[PDB]
């Protein structure tokens, strides 16, 4: 009994705070910044991706609480599609913002040519379309199976099932963990290496404090992403390789990893909007 209420509470608070943060970011962007800058456009895209991804938490919580899916096939397919689509959208938006900052800092001459609101809109549309290449296949492949006392959401398994599962899981792991981690790591490392040489940062005590604050922000963002997304990918990889008995510890670890993966979406607004200096100037 304690495990079920623990998991339900975890999902409930995570979902509530995630939607509140994302919608406050929406209101601030649409009222104050008007998406007149590339970074504001990227932040709005990130907020949209995170919001929809968080919105898929009540369905999972109800599915676990009841042990069955009462929403039916129509809601099941759209929820699976929203989950995969917006997870990939949020990850790609984080990658896009990291590359944007790297270009802004390490390539100042070309940043005048490229960092424009029109290019930001183009890149947002490109990311949203590219996420469809996975959101739509899982929209079609989503299926609802029935057992003696349960209704479960899953995917249809094209033959060979083993090959299909390996392909899908490996693709999700690579395009959702390895590539974003490498991109953000390289971009932010080069960005810090370049920022160490700026006269406005490598100066007096206040300039040193500003440089240290910048480095701390970069490191905390990268660490938050890695810590929030590594456990679920690793534990899913382990589950696909060895059999794990169904115990209380197993279920709690599984659901804690899932809630941590969503907590990334919840924390992204704080790291990128609330702690952003421009938004703070909106009195």
């Amino acid at each position: 009994m304690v495990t079920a209420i623990t998991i339900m509470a975890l999902y409930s608070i995570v979902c509530v705070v995630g939607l509140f943060g994302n919608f406050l970011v929406m209101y601030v962007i649409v009222r104050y910044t008007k998406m007149k800058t590339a970074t504001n456009i990227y932040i709005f895209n990130l907020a949209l991706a995170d919001a929809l991804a968080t919105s898929t938490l009540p369905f999972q919580s109800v599915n676990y609480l009841m042990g069955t899916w009462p929403f039916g096939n129509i809601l099941c397919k759209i929820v699976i599609s929203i989950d995969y689509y917006n997870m990939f959208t949020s990850i790609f938006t984080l990658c896009t913002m990291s590359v944007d900052r790297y270009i802004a800092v390490c390539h100042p001459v070309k940043a005048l040519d490229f960092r424009t609101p029109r290019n930001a809109k183009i890149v947002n549309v490109c990311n949203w379309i590219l996420s469809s290449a996975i959101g739509l296949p899982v929209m079609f492949m989503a299926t609802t199976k029935y057992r003696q006392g349960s209704i479960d959401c899953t995917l249809t398994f094209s033959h060979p099932t083993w090959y299909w599962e390996n392909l899908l899981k490996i693709c999700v792991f690579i395009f959702a963990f390895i590539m974003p981690v490498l991109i953000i790591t390289v971009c932010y490392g080069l960005m810090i290496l370049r920022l160490k040489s700026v006269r406005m940062l490598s100066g007096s005590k206040e300039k040193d404090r500003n440089l240290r604050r910048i480095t701390r922000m970069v490191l905390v963002v990268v660490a938050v992403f890695i810590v929030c997304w590594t456990p679920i990918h690793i534990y899913v990889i382990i589950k696909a390789l060895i059999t794990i008995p169904e115990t209380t510890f197993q279920t709690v670890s599984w659901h804690f990893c899932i809630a941590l993966g969503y907590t990334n979406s919840c924390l992204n607004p704080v790291l990128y909007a609330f702690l952003d200096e421009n938004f703070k100037r909106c009195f």
Binding site: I80, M87, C153, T154, A176, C257, G261
Partner: peptide, 5 residues
């Protein structure tokens, strides 16, 4: 993400 399944 690991949800459903």
């Amino acid at each position: 993400y690991x949800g459903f399944x």
